[PDB]
Design a protein around this ligand. Structure first.
Ligand SMILES: CN1C(=O)c2cccc3c2C1=Cc1cccnc1N3Cc1cccc(C(N)=O)c1
Length: 125
């Protein structure tokens, strides 16, 4: 059964736009989105649809690139490190819910490498 998805707006949280956050949307997220292994990570896990009633019994801080995309579009984040933390949470959730060698884990591993390649150098202020 599904919890509400993570928030993509929060009016008591201050917003910011930075060159690095713009890059995280235009380059990092929008490029990873197109990778052949991106599809599991483009939306919150629908545990009812996928018949994973344990998913949210294990994963307590869910995160996905659909949520990240919407947060970037809303200027939800204060800085690039906050957004990077959401990507890292998404990858780590996959490793936590699954185990080494699983197909979904191989997909996350490849996407994580591409993510790190792209954030290795960010634009400056
Ligand atoms: C983030 N996420 C998981 O952690 C996870 C664990 C098991 C199953 C899924 C996911 C998943 C996202 C997901 C999104 C859309 C449709 N289905 C999803 N699936 C199907 C799948 C993907 C790859 C391999 C298998 C398999 N068991 O071979 C099954």
């Amino acid at each position: 059964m599904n919890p509400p998805p993570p928030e993509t707006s929060n009016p008591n949280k201050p917003k910011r736009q930075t060159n690095q956050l713009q890059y995280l949307l235009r380059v990092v997220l929008k490029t990873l989105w197109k990778h052949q292994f991106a599809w599991p990570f483009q939306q919150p896990v629908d545990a009812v649809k996928l018949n994973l009633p344990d998913y949210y019994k294990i994963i307590k801080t869910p995160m996905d690139m659909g949520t990240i995309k919407k947060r970037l579009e809303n200027n939800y984040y204060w800085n690039a490190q906050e957004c990077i933390q959401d990507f890292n949470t998404m990858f780590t959730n996959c490793y936590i819910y699954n185990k080494p060698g699983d197909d979904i884990v191989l997909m996350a591993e490849a996407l994580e490498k591409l993510f790190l390649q792209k954030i290795n150098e960010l634009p400056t202020e």
